[PDB]
């Protein structure tokens, strides 16, 4: 049959893992209906999930999908995430050097500065309470990626409104309106860099496209700007929030990290394994019918790799539901796997490591200001993210 995820209510949004684990027990592939009404396939189980992410039979070119793209969706579709070789190879080569570890390490001073200033403005609240989402989890990633690509400061507020319509559309028409508004603005921002001799990443991409349209088309230029700004911000925002929630709702681990701050990098890794921002990888389409343990997914269907279930598979991560910052986290799929492995992983780790360190080093007696049952999770089956994260200190 077809399992409707919308009928499971907020209980699925708050804790989807028992539902995924129930499906993994009976097989790897399952037809489900998303809470928004889409019939997709769910791929569960760590071994199957890791394999499907790197399987060329599961394509990312929407030309291989039977699902139609709206005009607004198609306008931002020409990006590396929604591509197979050789288009994916060509597009990622354009910006790969900008996101290496050695190049991202050069941003560490500025990242620390952005974090230090946001922590200051948070600690200036008189009642000693704040929403960590609004005060640090959102401002930090959007500021870093905006300075890298050259988005003016007055333009960054509308990006939260737009991605708020992506992750949680009050009505599907609002997400479409946000996509057209973003597509129009990005085209205006691209045009504004032309001939201005800017040295930001978008200015370099505009010049690259103007010099040789075959290396980077104007649609691919728009798509590149789109994917770099959206895929960077949203996931990093939720990683900071999901991870601080994990530390504050597991006080023994917070104390262990406070005792030995060399476990910081391992704690962030387990943050990604325990409550990674990506619940399911982006849409994949089989170019031919694929047989998964007697279950045959037809060509062109929408396949969702449930990364969250892969991280709760006990044969790969023993005691999966335990948040252990000393755990062996090697081989998690939080950043994906294969040719589409997150190009922003070094930058995201740098942002998360500095943010978590600054919060703990500056604010002892930091605490969650609500009960874990009071937190609200977004009903998006693709995103594991909170509406807010109330905290208090001193």
Ligand X SMILES: C[As](C)(=O)[O-]
Give contact residues for ligand X (rule: CB under 6 A). Answer: 152, 155, 185, 188-189, 192
Q: Which is nearer to ligand X, 109 or 152 (CB)?
A: 152
Residue closer to ligand HEM by CB (options 122, 303) is 303
What are residue 307's phi and psi, to 5 degrees?
Answer: -65, -35
Q: Which is nearer to ligand HEM, 76 or 369 (CB)?
A: 76
Q: Which is nearer to ligand HEM, 292 or 352 (CB)?
A: 352
HSE-CB for 103 with a 13 A CA cutoff: 11
The nearest distance, CB 342 to ligand HEM, in angstroms, is 3
By a kind-dependent CB cut-off of 5 to 8 A, residue 231 interacts, out of ligand HEM, ligand X, none, with: ligand HEM
Comparing CB distances to ligand X, the nearer of 177 and 192 is: 192
Q: What CA–CA distance (Å, rounded) separates 282 from 336?
A: 10
As measured in angstroms, the least distance from the Cβ of 157 to ligand X is 12
Which of these, 385, 273, 279, lies nearest to 44 by C-alpha position?
279
**Residue 92, contacted partner among ligand X, ligand HEM, none, CB below 5-8 A by kind:** ligand HEM
Decide: 331 and 316 in contact? Cβ < 8 Å.
Answer: yes
Helix (H) or strand (E) holding 238: helix 218-248
Q: What phi and psi, each to the nearest 5 degrees, are found at residue 303?
A: -115, 130
Helix (H) or strand (E) run with residue 191 in it: helix 172-193
Burial group, residue 6, by CB count within 10 angstroms (0-12, 13-18, 19+): middle
Q: Which does 111 bind (CB under 5 to 8 A by kind): ligand X, ligand HEM, none?
A: none
Instruction: Choose the contact partner of 232 out of ligand X, ligand HEM, none; CB within 5 to 8 A by kind.
Output: ligand HEM
> Which residue lies nearer to ligand X by CB, 136 or 189?
189
Q: Which of 310, 287, 283 lies closest to 56 in space, CA to CA?
A: 287
Here the contacts of 169-178 (C-beta below 8 Å, separation 24 or greater) are 169/36, 172/36, 176/70, 176/72, 176/73
Binding site for ligand HEM (CB under 6 A): 53, 80-81, 92, 145, 227-228, 231-232, 235-236, 239, 276-278, 281-282, 334-336, 340, 342-344, 347-348
Residue nearest to ligand X (CB): 189
Nearer to ligand HEM, 336 or 381 (CB): 336
Smallest distance from ligand HEM to CB 259, Å:
26
State both tokens at 349.
């780790």
Q: Which does 136 bind (CB under 5 to 8 A by kind): ligand HEM, ligand X, none?
A: none
Give the distance, in angstroms, between the CA of residue 145 and the centroid of all CA atoms in the same chain.
Answer: 14
Residue nearest to ligand HEM (CB): 344
Return the one option of ligand X, ligand HEM, none that residue 280 interacts with (CB less than 5 to 8 A, by type). Answer: none
DSSP code string of 144-178: HHHHHHT--GGGSHHHHHHHHHHHS-SSHHHHHHH
Least distance CB 190 / ligand X (angstroms): 8
Closest separation between CB of residue 201 and ligand X, Å? 15
């Amino acid at each position: 049959p077809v399992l409707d995820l919308g009928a499971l209510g907020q209980d699925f949004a708050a804790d989807p893992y028992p539902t995924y684990a129930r499906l993994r027990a009976e097989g790897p592939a399952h037809r489900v209906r998303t809470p928004e009404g889409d019939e997709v396939w769910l791929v569960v189980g760590y071994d199957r999930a890791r394999a499907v992410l790197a399987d060329p039979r599961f394509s990312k070119d929407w030309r291989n999908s039977t699902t139609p793209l709206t005009e607004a969706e198609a306008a931002l579709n020409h990006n590396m995430l929604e591509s197979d070789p050789p288009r994916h190879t060509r597009l990622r080569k354009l910006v790969a050097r900008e996101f290496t570890m050695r190049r991202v390490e050069l941003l560490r001073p500025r990242v620390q500065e952005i974090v230090d200033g946001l922590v200051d403005a948070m600690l200036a609240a008189p009642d000693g309470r704040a929403d960590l989402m609004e005060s640090l989890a959102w401002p930090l990633p959007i500021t870093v990626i905006s300075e890298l690509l050259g988005v003016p400061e007055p333009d960054r507020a509308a990006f939260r409104v737009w991605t708020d319509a992506f992750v949680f559309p009050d009505d599907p028409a609002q997400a479409q309106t946000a996509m057209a508004e973003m597509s129009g603005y990005l085209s205006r921002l691209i045009d504004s860099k032309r001939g201005q001799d800017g040295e930001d990443l978008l200015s370099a991409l505009v010049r690259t496209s103007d010099e040789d349209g075959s290396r980077l088309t104007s649609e691919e230029l728009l798509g590149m700007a789109f994917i770099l700004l959206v895929a960077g911000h949203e996931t990093t925002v939720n990683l900071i929030a999901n991870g601080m929630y994990a530390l504050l709702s597991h006080p023994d681990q917070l104390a262990a990290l406070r005792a030995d701050m060399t476990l910081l990098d391992g704690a962030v890794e387990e943050m990604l394994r325990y409550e990674g921002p990506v619940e399911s990888a982006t849409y994949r389409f089989p170019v031919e019918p694929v047989d998964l343990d007697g279950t045959v997914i037809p060509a062109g269907d929408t396949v969702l790799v449930v990364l969250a279930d892969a991280h709760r598979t006990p044969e790969r991560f023993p005691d999966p539901h335990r948040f252990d910052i000393r755990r062996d986290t090697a081989g998690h799929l939080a950043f994906g796997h294969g040719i589409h492995f997150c190009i922003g992983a070094p930058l995201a780790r740098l942002e998360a490591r500095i943010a978590v360190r600054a919060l703990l080093e500056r604010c002892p007696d930091l605490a969650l200001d609500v009960s874990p049952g009071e937190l609200v999770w977004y009903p998006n089956p693709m995103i594991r993210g909170l509406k807010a994260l109330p905290i208090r200190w001193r």
